Amino acid sequence: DKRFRREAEFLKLKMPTKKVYHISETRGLLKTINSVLQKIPIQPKVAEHRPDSKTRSTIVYEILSAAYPFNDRKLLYEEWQPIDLVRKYFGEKVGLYFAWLGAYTQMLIPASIVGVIVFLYTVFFSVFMALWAATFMEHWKRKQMRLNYRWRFPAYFTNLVSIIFMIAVTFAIVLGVIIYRISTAARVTVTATAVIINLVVIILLDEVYGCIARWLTKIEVPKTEKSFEERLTFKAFLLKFVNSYTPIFYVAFFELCIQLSIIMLGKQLIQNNLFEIGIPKMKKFIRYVKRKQRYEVDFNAGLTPEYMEMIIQFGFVTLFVASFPLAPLFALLNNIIEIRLDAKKFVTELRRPVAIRAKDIGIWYNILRGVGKLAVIINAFVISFKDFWAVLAARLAFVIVFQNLVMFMSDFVDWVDISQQIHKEKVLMVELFM
Amino acid sequence: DKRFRREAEFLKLKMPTKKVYHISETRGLLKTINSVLQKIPIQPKVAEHRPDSKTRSTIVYEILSAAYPFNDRKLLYEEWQPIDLVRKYFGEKVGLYFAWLGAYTQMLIPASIVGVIVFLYTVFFSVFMALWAATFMEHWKRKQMRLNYRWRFPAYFTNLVSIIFMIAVTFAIVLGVIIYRISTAARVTVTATAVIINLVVIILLDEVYGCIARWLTKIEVPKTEKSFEERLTFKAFLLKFVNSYTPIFYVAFFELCIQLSIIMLGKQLIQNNLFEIGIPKMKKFIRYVKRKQRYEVDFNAGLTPEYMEMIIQFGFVTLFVASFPLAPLFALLNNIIEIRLDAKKFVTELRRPVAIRAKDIGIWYNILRGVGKLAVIINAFVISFKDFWAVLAARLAFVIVFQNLVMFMSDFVDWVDISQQIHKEKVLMVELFM
């Protein structure tokens, strides 16, 4: 692993005392910023007392201006399922990211088929769709165990402040859609353009409220780098899910589901893929013996949004699971596509580090559980949506039995291996201990 | 621990080989049935290798016709909160039984106060009552951690058979109430007598369907004595909760809540207390040097129903939590009363054994969680219960927002210590290990 860099020199000598702990390193000088690499077994045996080059620079990070750290990576380049050297090389938490990502593809897999069978020849698609959700959570957890075998008051005042400015942004979005209706007001295509500039403004407000949430999480003085990012993700899916889901919410009570699917595909392709590849050309044209050349390539890395958008994709998977079926299929196309571009995007990365000790997606996981939770009553609530009073009455009745039958089916699924190998493995642990 | 008793003699010698394992015992002969006591430190040190007289006869049971096993018990007799020698003497699982029983009293404690404040001067009692339920589960679990610190197809064919005969008994109860209406048919007091004979018939059908469920669980060939009793309890609360809750269900859709409270108090006093003390007089009049006299007293022990009725008491706590408030207060009187009679009932027991290794009530615990779960929508569903169509419409609307606000408050409570002592305790474990 390497490093970049008066008080920098003196505290650099203070850092060299930490190099004098048990470390072995070297320096490299070019382009008016310092750089220092390192590599060191007996000291790694002391590291083995504290708790395989991935583990090596990993433990170097456990030891610790800027800083950093390929024929097997080229073996990935030909090779890109990928979980073996993906875990061995890319990392564990991101290995879960591509892993449960590919699981999200696997949930996407048989689901679109029955949706095509639906669109051939009506709410049973939504019912068994919710079943597909619960099963997706189910084998998500089961497979999570499988790869687990394969491996003070002013803060709450600011919480109320984020509540108030949050709903202020929400009604601001309501001004986006209502003023969008005024914008297309004075055939369908004027509203299509208003949806185009509207989702463009959503592309604006995503970075706007998003980096605003970076100020919300950055101004919270987070000591730990596990819970601060967690609640930062909580606000992220909060305002972001408000941002995305807000327009379809304006569609529902305040048809245009084709525009919703256009925003789905363009949000997949034109926004995420094309803008994401645009960022590679942004840094690229902004710029535009073996280990020496790779160290030169070092001059040439968040995950949560790349997690969260899949959440948004799951939010794509959930909400309009009410209306139109076929968005799941092309959604799965964007899934496998963004899987491949995710892989090559990881190839394009700025030297992403290791990340150890994680069971699952956690905040994202139970966040998805709650996504199903709000999703059921939500999509039902749109699904039902003189004597017309009694019509809406019967509508509310189907809402009710829809709710009770819905969660009843949810618990019915919730009724649902290698612990035998855990037991005999522990018997072997005492046996080798003997 | 002791024992009672041709092939009995030969297999008795086979048992004496198990006495020749590491055991020390003695025999005693009277009244045409055999009896053998036992007591044995080095062999108990071998028992300490396998995993304090309670632990002694406990491990004797771990070693194993009929069989069995008091100035500290008299110290309980004056002493009867009781958790110290209750755990030390009475046992751990039953110590949880009296423990979370007294916790159920503690939930009963401040709850009746606001109910009196209600009955002075309307659904907010039910709302905060559900809050009292969720908190009851909450500090039930938290206190459970606190005392935790202080310590193939034909079977499913029979499951369908129990379903069919179960609903057959349910409609049979519907014949009980409807034929009870025919019975009082040809002022209110004729219906009071019909309720009297009705609940008497419920007292019949409790033992009837109850021992029928003993045939359901006894004919299931249960190998283990942990899951068979669990599902036996599941059928027990199933048919029993159907039995009790069936009449008020007949009251609701098919006022008489005073008769419901009369069945509550009489079910507490006349049924449970008076019939229970009647069983002591049943065996008593059916019958009607220190260790010698106590061994003579040995000639002179289920728990689940004694658990389950509290469930029924919780089922008393839940359902008519819709209608009338003051049944909680006298219910708490029956709670403290049945706590005392529970204590002296444990004094009256037929030499109850030890029971180790249990975190909590389990089947009963999440059974109570589901009791709240069905309870919320249930009591709401009774609580809302030309243009009268639109009246029931608005009724259904309050049902809906009642449901969403209800579970919303439930999760709001579900947002909610000595693990520090666990950590420093483990630091002391390595330290004493050092």
From Swiss-Prot, chains A, B:
Disruption phenotype: Mice display severe tracheomalacia with gaps in the tracheal cartilage rings along the entire length of the trachea. 90% of mutants die within the first nine days of postnatal life and no mutants survive longer than 30 days postpartum. Embryonic radial glial cells exhibit significantly shorter processes and mutant embryos display abnormal cortical organization and decreased cortical thickness. Conditional knockout in mature vomeronasal sensory neurons abolishes calcium-activated chloride currents but does not affect Tmem16b expression or glomerular development in the accessory olfactory bulb. Changing G266A: Decreased threshold for activation by calcium. Ca(2+) 3 binds at E138, D414. Homodimer. Interacts with CFTR. Interacts with TRPV4. Changing C257A: No effect of cysteine-modifying agent MTSET on ion permeability in contrast to wild-type where MTSET blocks current. The chain holds residues 123 to 909 of 960 of the full protein. Calcium-activated chloride channel (CaCC). Plays a role in transepithelial anion transport and smooth muscle contraction. Required for the normal functioning of the interstitial cells of Cajal (ICCs) which generate electrical pacemaker activity in gastrointestinal smooth muscles. Acts as a major contributor to basal and stimulated chloride conductance in airway epithelial cells and plays an important role in tracheal cartilage development. Required for CFTR activation by enhancing endoplasmic reticulum Ca(2+) store release and is also required for CFTR membrane expression. Changing G266P: Low constitutive channel activity. Decreased threshold for activation by calcium. Ca(2+) 1 binds at N273, E309, E338. Changing L265A: Increased threshold for activation by calcium. Signal peptide: none annotated. The record marks K141 as: Unlikely to bind calcium but may play an important structural role. Changing K267E: Reduced anion permeability and increased cation permeability. Residues 216-233, 275-303, 346-362 are cytoplasmic. Changing F316A: Decreased threshold for activation by calcium. The lineage of its organism: Eukaryota, Metazoa, Chordata, Craniata, Vertebrata. Belongs to the anoctamin family. The region spanning the fifth and sixth transmembrane domains probably forms the pore-forming region. It is found in: Apical cell membrane; Presynapse. The term 'anoctamin' was coined because these channels are anion selective and are predicted to have eight (OCT) transmembrane segments. There is some dissatisfaction in the field with the Ano nomenclature because it is not certain that all the members of this family are anion channels or have the 8-transmembrane topology. The chain crosses the membrane at residues 100-120, 122-140, 160-180, 195-215, 234-254, 255-274, 304-324, 325-345, 363-383, 398-416. This is Anoctamin-1. Expressed at the apical surface of the vomeronasal epithelium (at protein level). Expressed in the lateral and septal nasal glands (at protein level). Highly expressed in pulmonary bronchiole epithelial cells, pancreatic and submandibular gland acinar cells, kidney proximal tubule, all retinal cell layers, most sensory cells of dorsal root ganglia, Leydig cells and spermatocytes (at protein level). In the dorsal root ganglia, detected in small-diameter nociceptive neurons and in larger myelinated neurons (at protein level). It comes from Mus musculus.
